[PDB]
Symmetry: D2
Subunit: 281 residues, 4 copies
């Protein structure tokens, strides 16, 4: 039997990166998946962002990978900011798949890059709306289905090392990610009575398009004209106690899997770094 055999997991930001990885790993271990992603640029008139937008095709690819593990998947192209649309998608996914046992609130963005005193209200607001309020909305949408099932469940919120410590030029993201720790604790204290566990994962740098993009390469290596990942690697590695530059999506997925599984049945309220020792520094 797989470690989440017979369960259903709702994963946001599932089009690519960590969210894709979570969908696929959970499916490998026996779960069917409700996979949602915006699949559009975050800001309507704007495609020229450092972090590229995801596409409908990215989400279709996630679906094909999940089906390759002989599991079912319901996909929906929906913005976690649009609560009514998100709730409709989750409602339909639970109709189709029969239950909801696991929530992985993974969807998130980067924007901005100014000091916090020079950050625009537009960048601030978008950041809070997705990375904090969107996580709230994700749990709010899924949890009535988990409660009604009467079997308990497991909720994993994606924070960051930035939910535990700060770094210059990321302050709006740090505020949001710290707020996610509050959501984890608040939901944990309210939902424990239903044998629902709530925990957060805190990745260091992860090899996804959020990290590996031209804008980010240039920010980490302003001394170079056309830096790539190999140029950024030694700078990222300085943040770690283990001598690696970043973790992989599978590393985060393996933590999510642990929390989702019955092997972590009595683990709730925890902030778990998957950070190669960043938080020891």
């Amino acid at each position: 039997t797989g470690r989440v055999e017979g369960k259903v997991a709702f994963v946001t930001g599932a089009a690519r990166g960590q969210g894709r990885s979570h969908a696929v790993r959970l499916a490998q271990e026996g779960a069917d998946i409700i996979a949602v992603d915006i699949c559009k640029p975050i800001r309507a008139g704007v495609v020229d962002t450092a972090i590229p937008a995801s596409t409908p095709e990215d989400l279709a690819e996630t679906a094909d990978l999940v089906k390759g593990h002989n599991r079912r998947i319901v996909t929906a192209e929906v913005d976690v900011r649009d609560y009514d649309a998100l709730k409709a998608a989750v409602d339909s996914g639970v109709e189709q798949l029969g239950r909801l046992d696991i929530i992985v609130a993974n969807a998130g963005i980067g924007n901005g890059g100014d000091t916090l005193d020079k950050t625009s209200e537009e960048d601030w607001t978008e950041m809070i709306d997705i990375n904090l309020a969107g996580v709230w909305k994700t749990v709010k949408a899924g949890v009535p289905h988990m409660i009604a099932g009467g079997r308990g469940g497991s909720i994993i919120l994606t924070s960051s090392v930035g939910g535990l410590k700060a770094y210059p030029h990321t302050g709006h993201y740090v505020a949001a990610k710290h707020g996610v720790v509050g959501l984890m604790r608040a939901f944990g204290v309210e939902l424990g009575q239903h044998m629902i566990r709530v925990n957060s994962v805190h990745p260091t740098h992860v090899k996804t398009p959020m990290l590996h993009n031209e804008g980010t390469f240039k920010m980490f290596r302003p001394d170079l004209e056309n830096p790539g990942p190999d140029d950024m690697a030694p700078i990222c590695q300085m943040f770690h106690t283990l001598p690696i530059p970043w973790v992989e999506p599978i590393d985060i997925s393996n933590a999510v899997l642990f929390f989702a599984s019955d092997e972590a049945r009595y683990i709730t309220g925890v902030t778990l770094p998957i950070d190669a020792g960043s938080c020891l520094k």
Copy 2:
């Protein structure tokens, strides 16, 4: 002679409660004050709140108390959500008083009271807008004046025990107050280069109208028909290691004063509970 002699402090939520106490204590110790408060109900059409709104007269009373210590005060009736209006008020205050050395981001609200899965988006959004984004706006408005002075300075953010641990029916407030810890850390890492310190205070229950109101008395003591503070005291006391029911505004002001003063010149990045040992439980 005073511990903040010759300094100027910008205090939000100064109409009453802790913010009034901060303004008066800092003035007692030699600071002039830029005091801001919304001075009206939080939600335009709405006075049916458990926590009563502040008034213009409340802020005028604070001003009289500050003047009683032979210090100057500039007051403004402004909502911390309205960044342009807040910035204009602070700009005018610094014109009048000559400098800005201390920021105390104290303004905050309570609302709601449902479980977090049942919290309205209206209540959520108002809470984040004031208790998280309002604190960000407060620092953003004040800090250019502190940087430009070239003398360093001290920024104190008011979080809560709720910014460190959760309690049922307060989850949106907990998310905001945890976000405030992120703001503290983020501003701390960015502003240290200017010899600006950033720290947060985390009160337990404080005797102000935010705690002492009819709605709250009845909520803490549903067994009584007309409960007052004496009836709520033993319930609040159960949260503490020291056998007291709540701290007073002066207790929070004394911590603010410590952080504002040169006696805390090299203290930055700290989360300081004034909590009667709540966080030991």
Copy 3:
């Protein structure tokens, strides 16, 4: 293929309880075991302790269980306080089993029960010597074998909820268990360069003879003449967010297994509660 297939784990306190469970779970998942336990009363002339001593037969039983999973086990009856004897036992175990990949520093005691200001130096010293210095000695004995292997490895220290928060009448234990968090961090920063991860587990109450003994029953339920586990259960449950009285040894072993496995290859420096939400309170 087991999650620790082909590895060797060194587990202290392996005669019963959590340590036995760790040996057996790790064996089930493919590891051979170096299992050590004092197998005698902690204090030479003294058998009438609240927590009963382990016996040689207890350790023989652990061995039979590991062999039942078709794995190899080397046992040794040794006190973790006797560094030279412990080192000799580990040296022999590694000779026999070929490598050392995982260290589980699980041996521990309770004693005392007075307030910390009334705790005897005898009780203090024994507590520190086993629960803090014995953990240090365990890692010190095993890690040269792990380093010399050149394959990286994983070290798990057993702390407690008492390594993160205090409770009356357990203060010497709390000091030791907080010291264990220091050892985890210190070894983590030093050993990361070898791709050796170091983490700590923090159990709430666990159903082992350390919890389930006549002395402890009477302490939790002084109102009863002959209390048993059922009488203690509701008191223990008040410490938790999930409505359970205690976790089982397997719950701790499943966390140890996660950290020991390649699925946690980049997780280091973490304090992981398996505490049913005790640390949310």
Copy 4:
């Protein structure tokens, strides 16, 4: 009126450095002092230490400074490891001065410098005995006098940044200093009933002979033949968010004074860094 007018403070490690500063600062603010220090080398046959020993004359110099503030002082040359001697000294001090309101458990050492896997049991044991068990003994000796006074009180334990995070080659010290956080929490939960507050201070580098010695200069600047403090400054500064190389004893004393004073009457259970932002990194 001084901020600790009419109080008596018991300070260990009072011969020089931070302890001297605490004694003098508390005296300046109106407290009489029971000042203890070993005033001898730590290890009987041994003066070849990087950190120089204190002397009886150092303690006499502290006493002269306290008397210069027109306060009384009782001095004793006593090792905090010798509980019976320490208790006898405190008992006599309280006879002479009439009460005990404040305890400052400041005495501490450095030794060793190997990795934790290569640290001798001699160095380990001395470190735990003084920096952990010595702190326990200090509170144990003083606190009955505080309890019996019936006026409440304040206990400050000196930990370190090393009680919150680790650094290579300091692991035994880190274990002890983390244990001190456990003592603080344990005493906090037990003594709150008596209106006794317990808190810890966590200095970064402090300009005392523990930091400023030949051995340490050479260790921080192996590239130089005869390095002094000016050469060590930029290396220490790299650990901080504020651009300073170290704090001064007065900075720690100002935090001790705050906690000792009625201005911190409801503050208990807190870990307070005076660290120039080290813990933000």
